[PDB]
Design an enzyme around this catalytic site. Structure first.
Site, PDB file in Angstrom:
ATOM      1  N   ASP A  15       1.168 -74.721   1.933  1.00  0.00           N
ATOM      2  CA  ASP A  15       0.409 -75.355   2.872  1.00  0.00           C
ATOM      3  C   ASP A  15       0.044 -76.685   2.175  1.00  0.00           C
ATOM      4  OD1 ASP A  15      -1.088 -76.648   4.805  1.00  0.00           O
ATOM      5  OD2 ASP A  15      -2.431 -74.832   5.060  1.00  0.00           O
ATOM      6  N   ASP A  49      -0.305 -82.195   8.485  1.00  0.00           N
ATOM      7  CA  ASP A  49      -0.685 -80.625   7.909  1.00  0.00           C
ATOM      8  C   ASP A  49       0.282 -79.643   8.604  1.00  0.00           C
ATOM      9  OD1 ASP A  49      -3.837 -79.124   8.207  1.00  0.00           O
ATOM     10  OD2 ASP A  49      -1.910 -78.412   7.176  1.00  0.00           O
ATOM     11  N   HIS A  75      -6.550 -77.345  14.624  1.00  0.00           N
ATOM     12  CA  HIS A  75      -7.763 -78.286  14.629  1.00  0.00           C
ATOM     13  C   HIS A  75      -7.241 -79.592  14.979  1.00  0.00           C
ATOM     14  CE1 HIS A  75      -6.492 -79.532  10.601  1.00  0.00           C
ATOM     15  NE2 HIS A  75      -6.377 -78.277  10.506  1.00  0.00           N
ATOM     16  N   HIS A 128     -10.100 -82.583   9.772  1.00  0.00           N
ATOM     17  CA  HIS A 128     -10.653 -81.773  10.888  1.00  0.00           C
ATOM     18  C   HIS A 128     -11.622 -82.787  11.591  1.00  0.00           C
ATOM     19  CE1 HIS A 128     -12.344 -77.717  12.654  1.00  0.00           C
ATOM     20  NE2 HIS A 128     -12.124 -78.695  13.636  1.00  0.00           N
ATOM     21  N   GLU A 140      -1.630 -74.077  13.927  1.00  0.00           N
ATOM     22  CA  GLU A 140      -1.309 -73.086  12.894  1.00  0.00           C
ATOM     23  C   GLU A 140      -1.721 -71.828  13.386  1.00  0.00           C
ATOM     24  OE1 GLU A 140      -5.102 -75.319  10.444  1.00  0.00           O
ATOM     25  OE2 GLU A 140      -3.611 -73.752   9.520  1.00  0.00           O
ATOM     26  N   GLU A 195       2.324 -73.693  10.211  1.00  0.00           N
ATOM     27  CA  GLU A 195       1.677 -74.655  11.023  1.00  0.00           C
ATOM     28  C   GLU A 195       2.627 -75.992  11.224  1.00  0.00           C
ATOM     29  OE1 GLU A 195      -2.395 -77.061   9.920  1.00  0.00           O
ATOM     30  OE2 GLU A 195      -1.331 -76.020   8.131  1.00  0.00           O
TER      31      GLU A 195
HETATM   32  C1  LIG Z   1     -10.371 -78.988   3.301  1.00  0.00           C
HETATM   33  C2  LIG Z   1     -10.138 -78.692   4.640  1.00  0.00           C
HETATM   34  C3  LIG Z   1     -10.931 -78.770   5.780  1.00  0.00           C
HETATM   35  C4  LIG Z   1     -10.741 -78.382   7.229  1.00  0.00           C
HETATM   36  C5  LIG Z   1      -9.553 -77.751   7.389  1.00  0.00           C
HETATM   37  N1  LIG Z   1      -9.206 -77.424   8.811  1.00  0.00           N
HETATM   38  S1  LIG Z   1      -9.819 -75.947   9.451  1.00  0.00           S
HETATM   39  O1  LIG Z   1     -11.366 -75.844   9.129  1.00  0.00           O
HETATM   40  O2  LIG Z   1      -9.571 -76.180  10.800  1.00  0.00           O
HETATM   41  C6  LIG Z   1      -9.130 -74.904   8.671  1.00  0.00           C
HETATM   42  C7  LIG Z   1      -7.766 -74.464   9.259  1.00  0.00           C
HETATM   43  C8  LIG Z   1      -6.971 -73.038   8.758  1.00  0.00           C
HETATM   44  C9  LIG Z   1      -7.636 -72.570   7.501  1.00  0.00           C
HETATM   45  C10 LIG Z   1      -8.748 -73.073   7.193  1.00  0.00           C
HETATM   46  C11 LIG Z   1      -9.455 -74.162   7.568  1.00  0.00           C
HETATM   47  C12 LIG Z   1      -8.489 -77.628   6.391  1.00  0.00           C
HETATM   48  C13 LIG Z   1      -7.149 -77.012   6.522  1.00  0.00           C
HETATM   49  O3  LIG Z   1      -6.431 -77.451   7.872  1.00  0.00           O
HETATM   50  O4  LIG Z   1      -6.655 -76.342   5.915  1.00  0.00           O
HETATM   51  C14 LIG Z   1      -8.877 -78.154   5.116  1.00  0.00           C
HETATM   52 MN   LIG Z   2      -4.575 -77.071   9.247  1.00  0.00          MN
HETATM   53 MN   LIG Z   3      -2.727 -76.698   6.453  1.00  0.00          MN
END
Ligand SMILES: Cc1ccc(NS(=O)(=O)c2ccccc2)c(C(=O)O)c1
Ligand SMILES: [Mn+2]
Ligand SMILES: [Mn+2]
Length: 369
Positions: A142, A153, A222, A230, A255, A350
């Protein structure tokens, strides 16, 4: 007027007119009254709104083309035997070159996730990590690229043992279902329910044991904002969640994560990912080391996520306490690896999509996935 193309020529240099390739363009899904999106496909009003943000879409496309070329490259050489550090450095080296890294104007949107097995996300090795990719490992690659804060992303899962094939198919199908369901005026909870239905329609057998693939309930997609991975809205992954609708002009990371475990992740292992709180404003700091690290973070990452390895490469040393201080102050937030129960297997797929006025563009779609 052609030239080189193997992972070395910046995407920008491959397109003289500065116009980058569009991703997959889909018509928005119908509604109750079967209201299709064939009209919005060329609507004069929408066509204008869309064209108004053409510079924005274009930046996402440049970042997406970089993402496609980088991952195609990665798939050709990632193999068991390589250390996770070797994998991430080789990938990032290419990514930096193709995106034509230029401070906060162009570069890596976030650290290269390479979460293994029961761990589903946010794991990238820190200095000294001796972990070696194994034949039976299920690795989620990822990584992100960005142009002017327009983030891509996108992620896929790497395996070498065919025993995980149906698990990967399940998650890939679930993600594509989420992508198909997504649209303007679509309620987020409906996308999550649709995703879970497909995901759970898959049963898999691994090493003699059978499982009904489970979406990881506390993981999700997100909305994405400029320099903000996010932005605020979340795309569930299971039924019963998010009573909000997607809106025109929004960008989403669609994702899905599937697991043979409890279908729930928890913080585990050493933390490697960090990111400045988007909402925290300027904070005067006198502590020398803490002050310097915050400055380094602001100059190099801004509100984009980073990892310890990226601090090491900038020549920073013995910064752990300073980093802890920033976290304790709430200026920076830690994002530790998210893993399901020991022994479980997790998969992820994703894509980033643009909710354009005229259509839905799966900007990061490739010939691979
Ligand atoms: C640092 C960081 C902060 C927020 C993020 N987005 S999230 O919280 O919707 C998310 C999505 C998928 C795994 C874990 C977290 C993500 C990411 O999309 O992985 C990364
Ligand atoms: Mn993501
Ligand atoms: Mn990602």
């Amino acid at each position: 007027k052609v030239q080189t193309d193997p992972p070395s020529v910046p995407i920008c240099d491959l397109y003289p007119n500065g116009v980058f390739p569009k991703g997959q363009e889909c018509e928005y899904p119908p509604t109750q009254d079967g209201r299709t999106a064939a009209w919005r496909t060329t609507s004069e009003e929408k066509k204008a709104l869309d064209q108004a943000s053409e510079e924005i879409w274009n930046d996402f496309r440049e970042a997406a083309e970089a993402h496609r070329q980088v991952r195609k490259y990665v798939m050709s050489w990632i193999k068991p035997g390589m250390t996770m550090i070797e994998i991430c450095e080789k990938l990032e080296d290419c990514s930096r070159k193709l995106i034509k890294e230029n401070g906060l104007n162009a570069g890596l949107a976030f650290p290269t996730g390479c979460s293994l097995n029961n761990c589903a996300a946010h794991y990238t090795p820190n200095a000294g990590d001796t972990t070696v990719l194994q034949y039976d490992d299920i690795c989620k690659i990822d990584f992100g690229t960005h142009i002017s804060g327009r983030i891509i992303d996108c992620a896929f899962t790497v395996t070498f043992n065919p025993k995980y094939d149906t698990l990967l198919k399940a998650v890939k199908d679930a993600t594509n279902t989420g992508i198909k369901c997504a649209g303007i005026d679509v309620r987020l909870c409906d996308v999550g329910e649709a995703i879970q239905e497909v995901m759970e329609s898959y049963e898999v057998e691994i090493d003699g044991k059978t499982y009904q693939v489970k979406p990881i309930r506390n993981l999700n997609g997100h909305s994405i904002g400029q320099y903000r991975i996010h932005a605020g809205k979340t795309v569930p992954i299971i039924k019963g969640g998010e009573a909000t609708r997607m809106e025109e002009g929004e960008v989403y990371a669609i994702e899905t994560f599937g697991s043979t475990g409890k279908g729930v992740v928890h913080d585990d292992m050493e933390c490697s990912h960090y990111m400045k709180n988007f909402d925290v404003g300027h904070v005067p700091i006198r502590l020398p080391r803490t002050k310097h690290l915050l400055n380094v973070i602001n100059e190099n990452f801004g509100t984009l996520a980073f990892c310890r390895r990226w601090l090491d490469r900038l020549g920073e040393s013995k910064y752990l306490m300073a980093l802890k201080n920033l976290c304790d102050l709430g200026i920076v937030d830690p994002y530790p690896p998210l893993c399901d129960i020991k022994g479980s297997y997790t998969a992820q797929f994703e894509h980033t999509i643009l909710l354009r006025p005229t259509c839905k563009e799966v900007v990061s779609r490739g010939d691979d996935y």
